[PDB]
Amino acid sequence: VYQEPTDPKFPQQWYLSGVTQRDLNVKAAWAQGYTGHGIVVSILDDGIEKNHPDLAGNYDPGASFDVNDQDPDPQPRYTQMNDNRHGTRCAGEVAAVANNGVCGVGVAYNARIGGVRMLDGEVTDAVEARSLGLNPNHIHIYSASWGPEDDGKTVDGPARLAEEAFFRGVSQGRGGLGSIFVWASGNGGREHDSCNCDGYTNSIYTLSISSATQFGNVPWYSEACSSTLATTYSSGNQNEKQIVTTDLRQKCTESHTGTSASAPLAAGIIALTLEANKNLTWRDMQHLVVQTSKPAHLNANDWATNGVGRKVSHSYGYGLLDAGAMVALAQNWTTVAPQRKCIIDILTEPKDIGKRLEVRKTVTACLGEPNHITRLEHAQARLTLSYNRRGDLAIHLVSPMGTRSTLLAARPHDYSADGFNDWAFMTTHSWDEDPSGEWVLEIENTSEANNYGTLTKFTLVLYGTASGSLVPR
């Protein structure tokens, strides 16, 4: 039968496989014959050590570029502090070589791996766009363990070039099937940050991935939000194990940590899934993640069952990825119908927020039209509002099926008086629900202060299809 890797640190890779059920079920996918052969992954980060003993065999210059110095070679810049170790650590998680007596193995240890050196310098809009749009008919999957500052007061996302890169990627990338963008949801847990204030994670074009500790808890660094899709293991406290990967200067590390370690594991699992069905679209991939991810034994105080019987948490999305279940479901997967977009402008007049504002609206979700949606994918509440202290706001959106999504939780450090300017708060929690019916938006002041402001626009944007539903869970 299948023989598991013999690498010296493979037994330390607790998150890949084990008797204990606290893993991503990756060996089961390996046993089905999927190891990433023929799939190309690129790490958008601070560079990749292309000559690393556990990366060299899988390295792909076609999946690589150096946008910081404008050359083809993504070799990290070496410093005493080893500042530029981050990308190499991420790459090893995806595609470290197996059975070569070195370190551990990648989730997709036969995939090809590249890196874009783009974090080691000023990260402009143009820098991001040129990275996100690198060789989009060669690279299948992009992994990004970076984003806006996690100070818990920033609201920021892709500017014009980067957003255009996303739309070009999902539309024309991978032969029209769409580039797969995998994002780390953030490290702002300590600052009480929300990953919905991050336009990269909040994007419908990215699969935003959160973290769980070995013992199944929400890590200190974790950011909760409704835009998160699913979860992979990463670090926790000092009694919990961490991530084993390739390190700078041709070394091995057993202490890769934080949100940074979760996205690459998801990218690796998605690589195995694409090997099992190369015809999957970018939206297909998100459907697979929703259907197969596992809540069980993940601890959270906010698990809720949505309209179609799936458990969902703001800390974890639909739960832990399950590689075995992903590759199995992928094989006979029927391509989803083309994406519809139903735009519903909710307000007829501006509304003062005060202590609390509730906006109720019954919608038909474009009944009778080509964009009629009976099967929701992503939903956005695009909000424009003024307020004197942004971080005192909490915002909830309730679907017709009764699913309460927290669009925005209180952010104690966010003192901004700039409000929100058509910010597209996104939720994945009503996936596969029928969006026809009453939606409810709640905006409330969570502090005792006499705050003030006005909601001047609320566009409900629904994405999805009108066919192909499963019997609820």
Identity of the residue, 72 or 338, whose beta carbon is nearer to Ca ion in the bound complex? 72
The entry of Ca ion, Na ion, none near residue 54 (CB within 5 to 8 angstroms by kind) is Ca ion
Q: Give the CA angle between residues 241, 292, 90 to the nearest 5°.
A: 40
260 catalytically annotated: yes
Q: Which residue has the tokens 């996100």?
A: 132
Identity of the residue, 84 or 179, whose beta carbon is nearer to Na ion in the bound complex? 179
345 is in an annotated binding site: no
Nearest by Cα to 178 from 315, 335, 57:
335
Distance of closest approach, residue 282 Cβ to Na ion, in angstroms: 9
The entry of Na ion, Ca ion, none near residue 191 (CB within 5 to 8 angstroms by kind) is none
Residue nearest to Ca ion (CB): 186
Identity of the residue, 75 or 203, whose beta carbon is nearer to Na ion in the bound complex? 203
71 is in an annotated binding site: yes
Measure the CA–CA gap between 87 and 74, rounded to whole angstroms. 10
Distance of closest approach, residue 335 Cβ to Ca ion, in angstroms: 33
Q: Which of 45, 60, 120, 432 is catalytic?
A: 45
Identity of the residue, 78 or 452, whose beta carbon is nearer to Ca ion in the bound complex? 78
Distance of closest approach, residue 155 Cβ to Na ion, in angstroms: 7
Let me know: does 380 contact 288? Beta carbons within 8 Å. Answer: no
| Sites of contact with Ca ion (CB under 5 A) | 7, 54, 66, 69, 71, 73, 97, 100, 102-103, 150, 186, 188, 193, 198
Identity of the residue, 45 or 193, whose beta carbon is nearer to Ca ion in the bound complex? 193
Number of Cβ within 10 Å of residue 40's Cβ equals 22
Distance of closest approach, residue 172 Cβ to Na ion, in angstroms: 6
For 315, what's the count of Cα atoms within 13 Å in the CB-facing half-sphere? 21
Residue-wise DSSP of 237-255: STTS--EEEEETTTEEEEE
Q: Which residue has the tokens 């556990």?
A: 54
45 catalytically annotated: yes
Let me know: does 441 contact 346? Beta carbons within 8 Å. Answer: yes
Cβ contacts of residue 240 below 8 Å, gap of 6+? 213, 214, 215
Judged on CB neighbours under 10 Å (0-12, 13-18, 19+), 57 is: middle
322 is in an annotated binding site: no
Q: Which of 64, 222, 260, 436 is catalytic?
A: 260
Partners of 64 in the beta sheet? none
146 is in an annotated binding site: yes
Residue 214, φ and ψ in degrees, nearest 5: -55, -45
303 is in an annotated binding site: no
Q: Which of 52, 86, 256, 396 is catalytic?
A: 86
Annotated binding site: which residue ranges?
7, 46, 54, 66, 71, 73, 83-84, 97, 100, 102, 104, 128, 145-150, 156, 184-187, 193, 198, 200, 223, 260
Catalytic residues: 45, 86, 260
